[PDB]
Ligand binder design. Structure first.
Ligand SMILES: CN(c1cc(C(=O)N[C@@H](Cc2ccccc2)[C@H](O)CNC2CC2)cc(C(=O)c2ccccc2)c1)S(C)(=O)=O
Length: 373
């Protein structure tokens, strides 16, 4: 009993459904903080001043290795924003690779609706590319620094286990998934952009031009909770999901995420809700594969009553495959080969009748036209 990357297994945690974080130690002497893993941004930032929702924070004056870059930085997200100061310091991940690097670090001094009460994390690790980094692409992201300064392979993988998980850095651990890994191309290196070519609800094609699914863009984002879909796609998806679950009716607000519905302790009729499938462009011409999630992924619990929120929402900035999608699979961010792999997660939540799935190959033509330009 062991495994090459065994020490990195189960290195993620998450209080409630407020993100997944990994421990990271910065400065000298050591200052360890809980850092949110976010493939939807590219800045490494940590609370650096007292905040009502922070149990601890980065104290630069106590780190002898801290170097001030004398430059401010501001980062607005879909939800929240923070202001800070840039610098560099030594950074290691105790339950990650056995190395230490000097990386850029944004010390968060002011913030608005960023930190979350009870989340237990004090910072964020932007794992996306330099293109979307702030102030600009010259600020090298953490993973770029890790790869350039060490022998760590340019690849990381995530297994987010819903109701923490594993972030394998420099490789893959075969105990985190079952079946085979299917890869989709990273269309462009900024966000982890991918291309969705078909969508089905309980096997039924949504029947929309694939251009709508990627209108603007489609990305894999561990920092976003929901499966966010473009306006038109959202409306059509909701209509189909409602039709598929017609056995029982729910208020309009439920589908909008404004109303919660609770069931008796351990009585949620998962069987009445449909499974959702997204077909992704494959690595061979005209070949695709599909990933399928269950209501256990898109209906998220809320703090003897089990309350849930419909976690598929609308977006005006493209499709965002957030935690709702990632919690059903082991996702491999193979930066080295510009591709993202998906495999059924060994820890995903399911029941005795259904399971998440990754199947292929399928034949899909003109997938190149699905992308937005
Ligand atoms: C709009 N949605 C949404 C967006 C975001 C959000 O903006 N997350 C940012 C990181 C980010 C992380 C933490 C706090 C602020 C910003 C990502 O970099 C965003 N990615 C950019 C391309 C999308 C967070 C949550 C969230 O509730 C959440 C809380 C704690 C940890 C992880 C996720 C929910 S939604 C309701 O549709 O799911």
């Amino acid at each position: 009993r062991r495994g090459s990357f065994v020490e990195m297994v189960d290195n993620l945690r998450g209080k409630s459904g407020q993100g997944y974080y990994v421990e990271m130690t910065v400065g000298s002497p050591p200052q360890t903080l809980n850092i949110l893993v976010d493939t939807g941004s590219s800045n490494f930032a940590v609370g650096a001043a007292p905040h009502p929702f922070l149990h601890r924070y980065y104290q630069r004056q106590l780190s002898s290795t801290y170097r001030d870059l004398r430059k401010g930085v501001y980062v607005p997200y879909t939800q929240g924003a923070w202001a800070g100061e840039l610098g560099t310091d030594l950074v290691s991940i105790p339950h990650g690779p056995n190395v230490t690097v000097r990386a850029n670090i944004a010390a968060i001094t002011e913030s608005d609706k960023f930190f979350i009460n009870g989340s237990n994390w004090e910072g964020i690790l932007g794992l996306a590319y330099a293109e979307i980094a702030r102030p600009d692409d010259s600020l090298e992201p953490f993973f770029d620094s890790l790869v350039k300064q060490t022998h760590v392979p340019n690849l990381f993988s995530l297994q987010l286990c819903g109701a923490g998980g594993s972030m394998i850095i420099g490789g893959i651990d075969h105990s985190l998934y079952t079946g085979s890994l299917w890869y989709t191309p990273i269309r462009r290196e900024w966000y982890y952009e991918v291309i969705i070519v078909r969508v089905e609800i309980n096997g039924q094609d949504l029947k929309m031009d694939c251009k709508e699914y990627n209108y603007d863009k489609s990305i894999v984002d561990s920092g976003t909770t929901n499966l966010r879909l473009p306006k038109k796609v959202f409306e059509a998806a909701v209509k189909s999901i409602k039709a598929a679950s017609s056995t029982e009716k729910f208020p309009d607000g439920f589908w909008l995420g404004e109303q919660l519905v609770c069931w008796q302790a351990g009585t949620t009729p998962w069987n009445i809700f449909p499974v959702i499938s997204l077909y992704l462009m494959g690595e061979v011409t005209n070949q695709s594969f599909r990933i399928t999630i269950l209501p256990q992924q898109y209906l998220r619990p809320v703090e003897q009553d089990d309350c849930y929120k419909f976690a598929i929402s609308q977006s005006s900035t493209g499709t965002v495959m957030g935690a709702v999608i990632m919690e059903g699979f082991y996702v491999v961010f193979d930066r080295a080969r510009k591709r993202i792999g998906f495999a059924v997660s060994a820890c995903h939540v399911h029941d005795e009748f259904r399971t998440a799935a990754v199947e292929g190959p399928f034949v899909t033509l003109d997938m190149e036209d699905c992308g937005y330009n």
